[model samples]
Target: NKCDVVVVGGGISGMAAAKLLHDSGLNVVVLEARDRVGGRTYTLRNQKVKYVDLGGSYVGPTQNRILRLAKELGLETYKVNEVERLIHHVKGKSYPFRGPFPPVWNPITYLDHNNFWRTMDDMGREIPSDAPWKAPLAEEWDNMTMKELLDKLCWTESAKQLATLFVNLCVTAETHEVSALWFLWYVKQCGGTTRIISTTNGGQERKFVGGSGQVSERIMDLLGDRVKLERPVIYIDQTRENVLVETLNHEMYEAKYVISAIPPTLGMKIHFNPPLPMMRNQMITRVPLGSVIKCIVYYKEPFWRKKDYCGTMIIDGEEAPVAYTLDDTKPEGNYAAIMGFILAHKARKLARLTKEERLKKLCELYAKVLGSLEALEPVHYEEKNWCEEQYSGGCYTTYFPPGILTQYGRVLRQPVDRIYFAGTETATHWSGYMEGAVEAGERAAREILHAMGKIPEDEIWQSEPESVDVPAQPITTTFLERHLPSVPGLLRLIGLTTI
Candidate 1:
């Protein structure tokens, strides 16, 4: 069957783009490599628990596009459990602190913490979210890695470690792996570094009631039989008039326009008719996918919550497999759950181990962090090795290394003939988020529609920089402040207590 447009990849971006094109009265078809939809937002469910998102799960206050789409799809969302305590472990010592700043061993250490954050915030403001490569000092910044910037700032060793943790948590890559310009742009896109790392007013603020993957499924349902699964596109022959797409199994499709909604790394695998530009080829080669392995441990009840802990922990060390852990329990669910992200180098190393060994090591690590024997025993355990997934290759998202953004960034989203790009990586705002993916899809659809004279140029969607709605000041209160007598000024600063 012929279609007006053929959208490659059944991920959120592809589905969203196809949905818009279909709504505009255009015949659209979506081809997905996997047998299911949702792409990176994979949701797993069985007869036991309702659902568990093994992929992109969080939706923050600033991510309005995805939020609006979720609402339109009749999906409900609930706030993630509030973080009551902050725990940091380093050099075999566990430090429990209240509020945002890490526990300080001395006055100098506190200064290092404060200065590092202030410097990053100032630098983040310098990079324009919409066009980071156009910034005045973009080339200079792009030439250096984040590690170089940290060294230039002359941060203390302890401060460097803390900053590295934040970088790893946000990009899922080591500080040395990302360019300084790219890092700042990412911070700007998320409103700030603090916003990207926070749980309350940031990236981890809310989650879908059932599962995030359902959003893609709902969109697919509306498309009827227009979506085809297990169709991995391997080649594209584009012309000024139409584009011919070929899948791995030799199936062929011809459309007036083609939208590629897969990851940049995965997109590189497809053979282009005349081949992509040299810059595009280099850009894809330089932007490597960050390694991330998500592990979920399900329990009968909230055992850690009974101890008045928020079930959040950050572990430091290259040897430590678990970088971050949090309470993923549903508010009204019958069971409790904990999820941890094994990131970067640790993830790569862990991937080499057997599932049994990985599970055993995870249990041991959780026991050490929780100080509870109950962690060793779980009702169920699930892990998604994203690197092992042929379609995805990796998780979280991809990032540019030093000098890549300045050299080939513009070519990333540039349309070639009848082929257009639509993925979170091509998004100008919220680049690696679900909101970014949706925004990119809608923008691509609008671009094609405009080119077809369906709409005027003025009606094309415009992207805006992310603005911070939450306070800029650091949080300085503990859970005790909400329970015990506290000054009105202090309460007003941190806002109302969630607990």
Candidate 2:
């Protein structure tokens, strides 16, 4: 088959790109390996509550691309009305804490001991909302771990644990593996977790009016027969004249340009003829994708209403059950669903367990906070292992140790010849999120338009040059001394003020 453009991977990114290309009067073909589209944004329709989002569900106003697309499609958004406070399980007991605030009982003492809020503000001040990677203060915390940052700020044990749990839940990885500088960048994007985390109205996060699927649906509607399901493109060969894409069944499609919407990790599986650019290959191998198992339960009713408990639980220990939970019950009605998120190595292990074993563990964990599972037995428990999914291979994108976004993120998005890459992982504003996926799709579409000589040269959001700089400190100084200072005087001595 031949077309103006071929979009590989029928996920949101590809769908968005296809829609744009088709709308621009180009013959666009979308080849998906799976039986359905939407990729990670999956929906399970036949549950007790009727609808359960097994994949990407949350959306916010700050999500520019997603919000714009949803608006353009005339899709309504529902407020996420889950409880604001969370019950943190630490040292065997659960403690209730208010919205967007670390609990007092958290092992890290900074929550109560000192003005840790100021330190958060100080870090926030150092981080630029527009250019986080260019945060004038990143150098100061570049070498510190999240734990070390908390300690340097004189955070109590409870405060440390709270911050650790928060980072652990967000990053889906251990604290030691994450850079303190990256963590601060995340907080800045969040608008100071304590103040600007929640929506202005304090509603449940946010969701599509009809469903998140409306996004993929709208895009597919535009593509019509252009999208082919169950057609996984296994091999891609790029030549001087045309790019050839072959599926597992040996089916072939040829196009002038190929846009790969698959995640970096999964992209590694597909064989690229003449090999991908060295920088792209290096990024594919070095960048670590986030991994997690999401468990969605469809119940007959909103069980949390009966128990007078919000739908969130944070457990901290050697074997933390479920890091967080949400009342995913669609619409404010009796019939609703509860979605739980588990991540990191824990989620990796969970993904390997049998369904029965996993469900049993879920019941035990739920009972710990919600009394007994007998009363609120779900009609069915559905779990999707992002780490096991062949196409995605992971949940989202995460920064690896010393893997500063500035160092390698741009390379992940930069196009090589006629082959362009687009995914949530490559989004600049909201990487590793549904918003990022939508943003990337739109961004890639614009790039293709530019490449095709249809749009102006300056319209695309191209990769920025790397800005992670080396300080003027003597080369003899230890990496730790340069990144982690023993005292405030060391910073002044080095003439480092911002970071």
Candidate 3:
């Protein structure tokens, strides 16, 4: 019933935090609500499909935390297959384009495109991830939504549409839903909007050999019986002496410190005995999880590859419910698959439809984009709607709306008494990503360790470099251009001569 630490939520963040605490010689217990661990990073495997990530997947260049952990666990990674051209579907027409802009983009919109990202890059650089509210422009930026930011630039309707696509693709939320300051802070975390959205030297570059969930699985494996599955923390009573956690089934846990590793929004579901501060409660209530439904379609073979098409697609306008998609084929080519994201409003709308109807529409859209009738009859198909998940509520991560950042953002990661926060949303870099989850977990553990006198107070947390032995390939500027050119004048103006 009692331990040195009790980690609530056996996701990547909780498991990572527990591992470090155990390594520090602390007695730790992990409570997970689901029947299994891995939390949002759910991986599905079967005879038909070797491994398919139903949740978080992909790790790009600068996200070193999860990558280092994967290597430490002896896990390997594989690059996402390259696509020759990205199919952009807009206004009921599909156009294959090589650059970031849609093929139908007006040449005049280029200036607006450049200025938009340029302004984002500049603003992103000005905000520190840990303290976004402290930024000089925090109030000014937080008062406005991303849509308002675009309006300030006097962008054309076409350019605004493209910008909205970028926002939806990145955060799985509409531009009007997120604060300008929060959006800029996210761009800062990912190094830039270009880096966040790029496939080469970016966040969508590589995935674990088996699946991304394996990172959580491996961590839980090391944790062993210390992890208790299907145990959801229903209530918490924190005092100066210790923290008491109670599950719905009347199970109880007592610990010197508690790590609430669930999503900030979901954290609101638990009842705090003494109750959280007004600011903390308000923050949790205001910060809503992003809506996303990840769908993976399987085929007998890599049909699109044979046609020299890379399964990448960006569906814009009201053409289809799907927003973005990419090739998720395995290296051995035993099975060919494509993963697509149905985001935000579209995701919410589709969630109401029957599974049969959803699958049929999705397959039809894929058929049109792939230009192959085979797409409509995939060997297998599966989808994970994060909104439908009870504990999760939504997926990818949550976002701060206009005016919320300045008002209650600082309290997001700030611990109250014995309860500390550790999730992807709490991370300073790569927030809403696996790497961020790991970073937040490790940081929480370090904070606990320092408080317990197991570590020095002045010691700073340093991110370990990736140790995985990936097959080296020549990374040239051309590869950078191919990836970076998606953002007009982004690379050139930023003085990023080389990737």
Candidate 4:
């Protein structure tokens, strides 16, 4: 078989790559390992509910690419319910609070918490999203872990723990396991940590009407039979005039260009003929997927809403496996559901637990948070431990450890001869989100298109067009959200200044 390009993933990114290439008048073929087309965005169906997203689901403002794709594909988006108070469970008791921050036992943690966000946001602003290594303190930040940096960022013991938990929830990595510079770069990529934590008019403001997974499915429909599933691209031999994309069953397709749209860490599975660059291999080796297990349970009705509680909660200490939860009911209702995350270290330990054990524990958690036994009985339950998935190692996306970003961050999206790399990890503006993958996928297509002289150099970096049909809600900012580090008195204790 022969084609102009062979896309190596059937997920959102790979399908997007194939979509653009085929639309641009090129022969494109997609070889996906899974039997399905959604990749990481797997949406499941049940007779009781309309749909359930087992994988990547949420979308908010600044996720223009995915948002637009949804609109063009005739999909609907709805704002998540945050009208009620969110629960913050600590020690053993749960306290309902408005918005992201929870009520703290130590009053000083408020300022300390704000200091962490403000300072990190400022530091992240110094680095360019595309070229993180060029920042003034890139080397210094790159060498240190977020945990190491947190030690210096907060004053109170409460702030230290709070900051640690916050970072863990965001990246699905233990604070000590992630790099200082990479965290800053990643947070900035999502429009800073403030935007990352926001619920309404923020990072997770909305979801698709049916399921976010349908985005990939719709793209697959557009590409028709060009997308092949369960045909894992085993080898990418570029030692000849054309790259030969070989599948696990010995099927081969010769193509002028190839896009490895899978996670960076998964690249190790694909054998290369001439071998990859030493630095590229080293970078891939260091890059690992963020561990997370998403669990969704459906109940008879909206029980928590009756108690004036939003289906959102944050776990300070490990009362249960899930770190946080949010309402996952689709659109105007019909189904009542809550989605929680078994994140970071917790996911690692509980992932191997028997299905019944994990489900029982998670239901108990909901019962405690909701203060209702009704949570223990659900209409349906769905979960996805992305860590166990062979194709897409983990959910969210891959992250750089202490020293990988600066040394090899430049080659993340740069084409390696005839092969182009595309994934959410390679994205610049909104890495780790559906938007990031869509942008990266399209960019890789543009890169190949440009190389073939099908598009101009300037067109390669063209921005996604905005449509009024899918506008985002206004973002709210307050004093504490952007409090500068100018206060020497607080700054002294805040730890942004010299110790």
Structural similarity to truth (TM-score) of each candidate: 0.91, 0.82, 0.92, 0.95
Residue pairs in candidate 4 whose N, alpha carbon or C atoms collide under 3 angstroms: none
Off by more than 4 A, model 4: 103-107, 473-488, 491-499
- Tens-place lDDT per residue, model 2, 158-260, is 6666667767766676677777777676665544554224432211267775567767877777678988988887888876588888998678998988888
Cα lDDT, all candidates: 0.82, 0.69, 0.83, 0.85
302-411 in candidate 3: lDDT tens per residue? Answer: 78878767788888767587879989888887779888999899998889887778888888998887788988878878889998888887888888899998999889
How big is the RMSD of model 4?
2.7
TM-score attained by model 1: 0.91
Those runs of model 2 whose alpha carbons end farther than 4 Å from true positions after fitting are 83-85, 103-154, 186-204, 371-376, 404-407, 461-499
Choose the strongest candidate by TM-score: 4
TM-score for candidate 3: 0.92
Report the C-alpha lDDT of model 4 over 1-499, residue by residue, as the tens digit: 9999999998888888888898899999989999998888989887876688888888887788988878888898888889898998777778888866676554466667667777888898899988999999899999999999988878777777778888888889999899999999999888887678878757888888889888889988888888888898778898899999889988989999999899998999988888998888777888988899998888888788898987998877765788789998766765899999998989999978887888899889889877989899987777888998989888778888998899988988878899998888888888898898898999999999999998899988768766465565554568655653423446576675465
How far residue 293's Cα lies from its native spot in candidate 3, in Å, is: 0.9
Q: Write the per-residue lDDT of candidate 1 for residues 1-499, one digit (tens) a residue.
A: 4789999999899988999999999999999999999999999998566788999999876787888788889988887776566668788666776654567666555556666676677777777776788888999999999989887763478888888888888888988999999998888787776678777766787789999999999999999999999999998987535688999877999899999999987878799987887877777777877888898888888787776667777888876788788788987846688889988878888888887788788888877777789989888788897877888868788788999888888888888878888989888778888989999999999989998999999766765344242223343334532233222333455576644
Global CA lDDT of candidate 3, please? 0.83
